[PDB]
């Protein structure tokens, strides 16, 4: 508790770097927590006029997952401003083109709509796979828990667990598969 | 203003809508489905 004034204040308002794994996660749920950490709403010292907001590093963005048919239905529209410059693109296409786009747009959508949005977007770092500049790796304080529990496929289960789950019904020996 | 009776189905005052939504029929739901019973 006993610090000099300067180092005390420096410690309190310190920036922190969080790591967030995106594999098999919905871009929305990712963007929710990314948003909170970006605005610095996780800090009890929070205020809108204090610069406090933290770096967020999201990785494996390419492997993002989308509930339901959203890959097909959801469209991202933009306009170049020139007549006939209106462009609608299915999320699948956008993602195929630019791996980072989806999650970035989501986060950009969930920040408050003032000017600071442009700044706290500068503290966001998005990597399609896990390849990160060692520079940015050396800043990471901690890794946030992934917001969706990823179900294992059928081949992921140990034979113990497979034999531990009951055969529910008994097939006739005559029947062919 | 529209006549009491009309062709086009006549949007209700919001409170009446609430009233309608509250009073909907609720079918009795058996504790166990009679089919999965013996």
């Amino acid at each position: 508790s006993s610090f000099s004034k300067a180092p005390q204040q420096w410690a309190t308002f310190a920036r922190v770097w969080y790591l967030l794994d995106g594999k098999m996660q919905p871009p929305g749920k990712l963007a929710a927590m990314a948003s909170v950490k970006l605005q610095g709403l996780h800090k009890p010292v929070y205020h809108q006029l204090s610069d406090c907001g933290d770096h967020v590093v999201i990785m494996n963005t390419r492997h993002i997952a989308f509930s339901g048919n959203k890959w097909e239905q959801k469209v991202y529209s933009s306009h170049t401003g020139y007549p006939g410059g209106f462009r609608q693109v299915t999320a699948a296409q956008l993602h195929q083109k630019d791996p980072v786009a989806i999650v970035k747009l989501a986060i950009y959508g969930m920040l408050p709509k003032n000017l600071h949005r442009r700044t706290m977007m500068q503290r966001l770092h998005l990597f399609p796979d896990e390849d990160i500049p060692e520079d940015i790796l050396k800043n990471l304080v901690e890794e946030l828990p992934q917001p969706r529990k990823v179900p294992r496929r059928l081949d992921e289960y140990t034979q113990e667990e497979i034999e531990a789950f009951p055969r529910v019904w008994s097939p006739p020996e005559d029947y062919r598969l | 203003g529209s006549k009491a009776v009309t062709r086009h189905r006549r949007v209700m005052h919001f409170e009446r809508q609430k009233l309608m939504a509250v009073t909907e029929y609720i079918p009795p739901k058996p504790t166990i489905n009679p089919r999965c019973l013996p």
């Binding site: 239905q73 959801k74 179900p151 789950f165 005559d174 | -």
Partner: protein, 162 residues
């Protein structure tokens, strides 16, 4: 489980049925009076698309559903299980239940988009260009309404459209 074998020898072809061993229903069910296979294990309103260990028990090695009179499911639960299996396939679970085709594994396509809880088939769905405003809004289906009776531990009903 009965395999059918075919052999070609010297312009004579032999086709014959051969019986293998079938695993049996686990010894002691919780609700033995219970009629339908799901229900005597107390699985009603519990299994989801996510539970593979349950789902793989009704299907064919090539991935399709097993017929109802063979399995013995209550009609309703059959439909539910079918939905779940479709969803599970689409979700990239049960990778071993596809048909094997030596040629087609080689020609890569854009890496499979990870998805889950998908009600329709990917090829059949038009992109919704027009969205629409707050009052008339086009909502995107998620999961299936056949499952809307699953037990909710949160207490809030599952959200079937966004």
């Amino acid at each position: 489980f009965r395999e059918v074998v075919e052999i070609l020898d010297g312009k004579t072809t032999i086709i014959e049925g051969r019986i293998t061993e079938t695993p049996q229903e686990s010894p002691n069910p919780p609700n033995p009076t219970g009629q339908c296979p799901i229900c005597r294990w107390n699985l009603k309103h519990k299994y989801n698309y996510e539970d593979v260990l349950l789902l793989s028990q009704f299907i064919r090695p090539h991935g399709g559903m097993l017929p109802r009179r063979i399995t013995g499911l209550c009609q309703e639960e059959h439909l539910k299980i079918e939905e779940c299996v479709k969803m599970a396939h689409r979700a990239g679970l049960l990778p071993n239940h596809r048909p094997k085709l030596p040629e087609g594994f080689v020609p890569k396509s854009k890496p499979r988009l990870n998805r889950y809880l998908t009600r329709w088939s990917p090829r059949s769905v038009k992109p919704i260009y027009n969205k629409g405003h707050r009052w008339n809004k086009v909502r995107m289906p998620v999961g299936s309404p056949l499952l809307k009776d699953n037990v909710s531990y949160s207490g809030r009903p599952l959200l079937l459209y966004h």
